[PDB]
Amino acid sequence: EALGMVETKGLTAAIEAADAMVASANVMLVGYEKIGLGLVTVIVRGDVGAVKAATDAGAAAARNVGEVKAVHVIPRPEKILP
Amino acid sequence: QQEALGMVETKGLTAAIEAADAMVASANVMLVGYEKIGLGLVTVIVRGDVGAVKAATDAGAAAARNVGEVKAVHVIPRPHTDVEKILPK
Amino acid sequence: EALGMVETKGLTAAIEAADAMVASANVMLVGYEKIGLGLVTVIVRGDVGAVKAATDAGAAAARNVGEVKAVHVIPRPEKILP
Amino acid sequence: QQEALGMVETKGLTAAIEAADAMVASANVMLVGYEKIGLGLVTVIVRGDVGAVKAATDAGAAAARNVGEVKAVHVIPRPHTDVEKILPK
Amino acid sequence: QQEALGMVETKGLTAAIEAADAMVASANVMLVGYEKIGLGLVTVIVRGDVGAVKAATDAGAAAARNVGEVKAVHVIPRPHTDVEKILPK
Amino acid sequence: EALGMVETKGLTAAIEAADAMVASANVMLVGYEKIGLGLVTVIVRGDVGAVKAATDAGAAAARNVGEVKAVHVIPRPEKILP
């Protein structure tokens, strides 16, 4: 049960990422995190395969809207989230 | 391709309220809400038909431009079963 | 029943605007909004005439304290506020 | 011209607490509170007589300057019926 | 010199979650939590033995560097009676 | 019963200051304050002597981690805090 995240500059690029990820595979949206400097992180949860597929599609879709600052998959054993 | 989310991201809140007003008066769109992400950035979100949403965002963006900076303008067509599920809310 | 707003860089310029607007005409102070980057929006509600008079006086008074970033009147039919 | 609001806006919180202390010890002014607006900006607000408020803000600004940056210093004379009504509180 | 606090401060949240994961898998350290201070800065805090904490922070910092910027890496040895008392929590 | 504070750029430098202050003298940690721009203020309370000793040690320790923006002691008569 992996965690996946797309970090963007702008919220529009983050919602675009969230839409692309959930349509792409069997992943559940955990939520959003605002850390300032116009930075928003979109977090998904699901099996490793579904998470890797979702983040690649979420990053590719956000890229067309705004600047993607980070794309990452953590195949974890939600304790690690804020 | 029937249901959609629309957004106008501005630098300044006045430009965002101006966008929200122009959107709802220009097309058959319902205001979902606002989001503050820091750096003076505010996102205005609307919901309605893809055609209505594309028309609202173009009018929202044009009206906000007269007040402040518009940083982003975007339309996301949605499945219609859980249109608002992808929003932070 | 119009909405009026003065957006400033600095809070002192915003409180100065709020004071000038409420003394100028029959307008009710809705509140303040902080959006970061030192930006503060002062919002008033009242009839269109009273709102246009208040915002012109609020902008002119704030100008003497700090930098006014936006001045606007919306003659609306509070649903549109955050 | 009898009741007034006073403010000292600083870059840094230490300079703001230093201003608040200098204000209350220098003149017959009551501390209303603080406001954080981002960009490291903090506003200290005082209430009292116009004369006392002008004297407190000058001492608050001078004391804060030794600690940090002072971005704004201002006095607003108020009607006395609803002195604090204009504040965000 | 037995109990310690460790921290990795990053620009970006993804780099912070990556640090948190690398820390807990690399050494016998417990994740305390996160702190957002603005400017896109996030601090990840761990608790454990001084040796384990120095090993976790080095692995957390190295793993975060592959994702984003690491702004600070630090180890604070603690008395063991009230290890977490100094944290903002 | 004085107030003492160390203002830093970064949270790590602030926690380092808090640790150095509490070990240095008989001072109680009031708390932390985040004002944005990566600025964090660490506040202590105790007798004037203990507070002056704590802030000097807290500033010296933070200096080795990050940039200290302010160091100050107020020998007060907690009303003055946010």
D85–C29 CB contact, under 8 Å: yes
Residue from E49, E39, E41, E35 nearest E6 by CA: E49
Partner F contacted by E76 (CB < 8 A): yes
F76/chain D closest Cα distance in angstroms = 8
Rounded to 5°, angle at Cα B47 from A13 and B42 = 45
Residue from E52, E64, E47 nearest E11 by CA: E64
Assign F11 to helix, strand or coil: helix
Partner E contacted by A72 (CB < 8 A): yes
The distance from CA A49 to its chain's CA centroid, rounded to whole angstroms, is 14
Cβ contact D43:D9 at 8 Å: yes
DSSP 8-state assignment for residue C73: E
Q: If you measure CA to CA, which chain F residue comes closest to E7?
A: F12
Assign C10 to helix, strand or coil: coil
Q: Which chains touch F (3 or more CB pairs under 8 A)?
A: D, E
Domains of chain D: 1-89 (3.30.70.1710)
Partner B contacted by C15 (CB < 8 A): no
Partner E contacted by F65 (CB < 8 A): yes
Mutate to test the interface with A, among E10, E13, E18, E46 (most CBs of A within 10 A): E13
Contacts of E77 (CB under 8 A, 6+ apart): E1, E2, E3, E4, E50
Q: If you measure CA to CA, which chain E residue comes closest to F27?
A: E86
D18–F74 CB contact, under 8 Å: yes
E45/chain A closest Cα distance in angstroms = 12
Other C-beta atoms closer than 10 Å to the C-beta of E54 total 16
Indicate the residue of B72, B78, B88 with minimum beta-carbon distance to A32: B88
E-state strands within chain E: 3-11, 30-38, 41-49, 69-78
F10–E71 CB contact, under 8 Å: yes
Residue from E85, E84, E88, E86 nearest E30 by CA: E84
B/e letters for C39-52, b = 16+ CB within 10 Å, e = fewer, are bbbbbbbbeeebbb
Half-sphere exposure of A71 (CA within 13 A, CB side): 19
**E85/A46 Cα distance (integer angstroms):** 36
Resolution as reported, in Å: 2.3
Neighbouring-strand partners of residue D46:
D6, D31
**C61/C58 Cα distance (integer angstroms):** 5
D14–F72 CB contact, under 8 Å: yes
C36–B40 CB contact, under 8 Å: yes
Partner E contacted by F16 (CB < 8 A): yes
* Experimental approach taken: X-ray
Other C-beta atoms closer than 10 Å to the C-beta of D3 total 17
Q: Which chains touch B (3 or more CB pairs under 8 A)?
A: A, C
E37–F13 CB contact, under 8 Å: no
For chain A, the first-to-last Cα distance in angstroms comes to: 17
- Named by the residue before each, gaps in chain C exceeding 2.5 A from C to N are 77
Reading the block at residue A71, the tokens are 């794309």
Assign E49 to helix, strand or coil: strand
**F67/E42 Cα distance (integer angstroms):** 17
Cβ contact D35:C5 at 8 Å: no
Task: Label the pairing between strands D30-38 and D41-49.
Answer: antiparallel
A3/chain E closest Cα distance in angstroms = 10
Q: Which chains touch E (3 or more CB pairs under 8 A)?
A: A, F
Cβ contact A14:A32 at 8 Å: yes
Indicate the residue of A35, A71, A81 with minimum beta-carbon distance to E42: A35
